Amino acid sequence: MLEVQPGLYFGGAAAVAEPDHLREAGITAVLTVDSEEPGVEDLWRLFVPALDKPETDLLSHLDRAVAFIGQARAEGRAVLVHSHAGVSRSVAIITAFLMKTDQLPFEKAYEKLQILKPEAKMNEGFEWQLKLYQAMGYEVDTSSAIYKQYRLQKVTE
């Protein structure tokens, strides 16, 4: 588990398997972005079912994911975003959050994460999706031509 900024952490399956460091970081909100879901405090969770594949549509879930993290942080809760390896799915979500909150281009946000964890390497599909996210104004605009074209491409063989 690695701290991105105060109250905001990301990691892999390890991070959730050892709920002591979790307790010590005071984490009470957990966003799982993975193929499956993983104390004495109320706990909030969001599960975003997703495989670590370029064909996986994370883009459509980004506003929900970012809203979950944002609301938790706005409420003073520490947040963990985790995948299986802590390298791609969770990395994409964190990047999207940094992008939207700071209004930061994809390359700048991702650069920040890679400094923190050089082993961070989201799949190439997720990179493209975050570029679309920026191009849409850091939003999932379902009425945009960008989103419609992206979804048409997603359903092709």
Structure-solving method: X-ray
**Resolution in angstrom units:** 2.0
d(CA 112, CA 149): 30
Contact 8, 14 (CB under 8 A): no
Q: Give, in order, the Cα–Cα distances in Å from 1 to each of 4, 17, 77.
A: 10, 11, 16
Contact 115, 44 (CB under 8 A): no
Q: Which domains does the chain have, with CATH numbers?
A: 1-157 (3.90.190.10)
